[PDB]
Design a protein around this ligand. Structure first.
Ligand SMILES: [Cl-]
Ligand SMILES: [Cl-]
Length: 162
């Protein structure tokens, strides 16, 4: 089990524009296109993204290419972030995947807002962090996926995903 396999489970694969759980125009493996209502604003972003006229449909390879970019982007943003970097540096390899998961999902800024939770992770207080993470809109909106992430943090194993 690796970060890619983990995210593929949590996000799905879709070859045609769709709306995310939040109403947003998305494609491939959890690749957000825009927060605008316009289906046209989405089709434009999408061609910009691919370098072709997609007319809202992409190939597997293309979805994978975007997936590589996003995971890379997520990892670099953590390493570049003053709040995130220390947490990540302090973590084991499994728990590190958990932090990348959250960042890919909610962006650097959002995750950086979980001040208390981050502090508890850094102090290796697994149970308490898992309890704090749960008290969020994130958890309330996408509970099954959040629970899987939370369990990964609490345990340090890939149980939730196997
Ligand atoms: Cl709450
Ligand atoms: Cl969910």
């Amino acid at each position: 089990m690796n970060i890619f396999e983990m995210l593929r489970i949590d996000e799905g694969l879709r070859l045609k524009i769709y709306k995310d759980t939040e109403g947003y125009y998305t494609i491939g493996i959890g690749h957000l296109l825009t927060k605008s209502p316009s289906l046209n604003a989405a089709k434009s972003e999408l061609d910009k993204a691919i370098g072709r006229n997609c007319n809202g449909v992409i190939t597997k390879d293309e979805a994978e290419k975007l997936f590589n970019q996003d995971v890379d982007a997520a990892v670099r943003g953590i390493l570049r972030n003053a709040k995130l970097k220390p947490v990540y540096d302090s973590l084991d390899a499994v728990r590190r995947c958990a932090l990348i998961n959250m960042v890919f999902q909610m962006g650097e800024t959002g995750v950086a807002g979980f001040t208390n939770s981050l502090r508890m992770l850094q102090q290796k207080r697994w149970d308490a962090a898992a309890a704090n993470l749960a008290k969020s809109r994130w958890y309330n909106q996408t509970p099954n996926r959040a629970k899987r992430v939370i369990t990964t943090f609490r345990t340090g194993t890939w149980d939730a995903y196997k």
